[PDB]
Amino acid sequence: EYPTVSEIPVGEVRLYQIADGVWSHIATQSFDGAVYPSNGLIVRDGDELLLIDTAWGAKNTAALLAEIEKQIGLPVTRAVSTHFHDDRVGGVDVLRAAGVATYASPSTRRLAEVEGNEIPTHSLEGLSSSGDAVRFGPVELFYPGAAHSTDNLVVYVPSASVLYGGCAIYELSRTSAGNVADADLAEWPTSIERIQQHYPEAQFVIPGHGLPGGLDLLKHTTNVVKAHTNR
Ligand SMILES: O=C(O)c1nccn1CCn1ccnn1
Ligand SMILES: [Zn+2]
Numbered sequence: 001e002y003p004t005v006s007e008i009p010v011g012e013v014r015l016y017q018i019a020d021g022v023w024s025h026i027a028t029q030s031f032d033g034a035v036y037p038s039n040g041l042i043v044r045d046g047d048e049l050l051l052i053d054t055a056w057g058a059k060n061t062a063a064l065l066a067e068i069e070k071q072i073g074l075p076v077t078r079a080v081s082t083h084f085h086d087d088r089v090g091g092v093d094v095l096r097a098a099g100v101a102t103y104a105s106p107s108t109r110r111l112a113e114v115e116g117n118e119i120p121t122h123s124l125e126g127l128s129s130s131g132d133a134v135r136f137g138p139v140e141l142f143y144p145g146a147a148h149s150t151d152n153l154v155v156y157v158p159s160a161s162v163l164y165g166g167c168a169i170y171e172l173s174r175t176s177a178g179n180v181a182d183a184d185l186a187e188w189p190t191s192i193e194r195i196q197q198h199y200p201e202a203q204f205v206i207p208g209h210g211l212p213g214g215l216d217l218l219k220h221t222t223n224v225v226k227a228h229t230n231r
């Protein structure tokens with residue numbers, strides 16, 4: 001069963017096997033007086049591992065590396081952060097110190113610097129316009145346009161039909177927008193349709209936070225976003 005927020009003390013990290021060679025990682029973190037869970041992705045990249053997103057903080061990200069070594073035992077050689085917030089880049093300096101080459105779009109790198117967050121070393125080219133897709137080892141990186149944030153990316157693992165939606169995709173049980181301080185509410189439904197059109201065969205959809213689902217999470221997220229806009 002997928003680990004839940006109450007089951008993970010802040011500072012620990014769980015790995016969840018989605019498919020052969022694909023894991024989510026789940027951590028927990030305090031934010032404005034409550035503790036939330038957060039998802040990232042791990043994908044076998046030949047004899048190496050590709051990491052999608054930090055574990056939301058330096059201490060969680062160190063635990064993430066320890067759990068990976070304990071349970072998978074292959075070296076994390078590259079990391080992609082899918083937008084500039086701390087659940088995505090917080091921990092990039094621990095990654096860098098551990099030997100991991102860290103990556104993000106130029107937009108994400110810039111926004112991280114402006115926010116005072118940690119900054120991935122390397123710029124990902126080919127993602128500057130909505131609908132852009134690039135291959136990055138065993139995954140496809142896709143920029144659907146502005147949504148949860150203006151820079152947010154999604155990730156697809158073709159070998160397993162795994163779509164990592166990041167914070168642009170809400171879990172089924174989440175019915176309120178919550179904090180959308182950096183969101184483009186007007187563009188968000190448009191961005192989700194680009195995801196739907198580009199990955200119609202996705203079988204596993206992973207939100208940025210919470211329980212995995214299927215393509216229903218896309219329609220679900222548009223419903224939430226639009227309701228927050230009509231009141
Ligand atoms: O909304 C987000 O994606 C987010 N990321 C970090 C903090 N937040 C807000 C609080 N939150 C987390 C999960 N659910 N709500
Ligand atoms: Zn965010």
Ligand SMILES: [Zn+2]
Pocket residue numbers: 085087167208209
């Ligand atoms: Zn988030």
